Design a protein around this nucleic acid. Sequence first.
DNA 1: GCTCCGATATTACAGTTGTAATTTT
DNA 2: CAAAATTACAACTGTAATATCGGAG
Lengths: 120, 120
Amino acid sequence: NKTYEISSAEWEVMNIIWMKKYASANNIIEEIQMQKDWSPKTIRTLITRLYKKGFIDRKKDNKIFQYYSLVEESDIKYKTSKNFINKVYKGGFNSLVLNFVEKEDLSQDEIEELRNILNK
Amino acid sequence: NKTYEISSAEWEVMNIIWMKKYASANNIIEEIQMQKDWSPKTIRTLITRLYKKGFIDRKKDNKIFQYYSLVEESDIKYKTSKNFINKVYKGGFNSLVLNFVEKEDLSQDEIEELRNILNK
DNA sequence: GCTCCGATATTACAGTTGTAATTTT
DNA sequence: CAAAATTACAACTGTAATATCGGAG
Ligand SMILES: [K+]
């Protein structure tokens, strides 16, 4: 009946899951621990949560649960970014891009690259 | 050690206060209720919370409170977006921009608008 | 005086999230 | 010191309800 969301800490599990396509909590724990610095009890909880929310699902490979995504990366990211831009920016997308630009956040080469992603 | 956040509902009040520069709780309530439909008991609560977190301050005008922001809009939105993009996009800004191009579809007008902003 | 009102303050209560520890299998 | 499920628990959020203070009468 209710829709759920991916929390900020949950984005890390998701990203890792997407990277590995198919992975135990352990596989995921090792990786996250190279980046961020969290307890395996923590990472395991986040996993559980994503699972109860139905963002991820699992199969038992030889006794151990493997986790995989049930939502497509680009779709949910966009969905998310679209939602973020709307709460923060009254000007929408262009406004965001303008904000990043006036904060010299983009290098000459970067502006180059974006003009190519556009020039499609 | 405490740093506070602006919550999702709160970005509504914050934007109104930045537009109006100077507003009473009632000003703000009247404005929000045009767009979104929230109780004033809610809006007042969020103004209070934003006040207690130190994002907005107030001086009294004929016994009525006038709220104003203490944080520079462009900095805070930028800092916020920098945070969001990094948690969601392993590829950062350009990854996000690409994501919209491959998902969203808008005219050569919009594509130009951006190109005009990038170009500067 | 105290009386009623709108502005402001205090309080409520559950769902989400960060950050885990304890229990079961 | 397993892996997985259960429980913990305060802070932060959404979403208000209720209580009270300072003036217009
Ligand atoms: K950069």
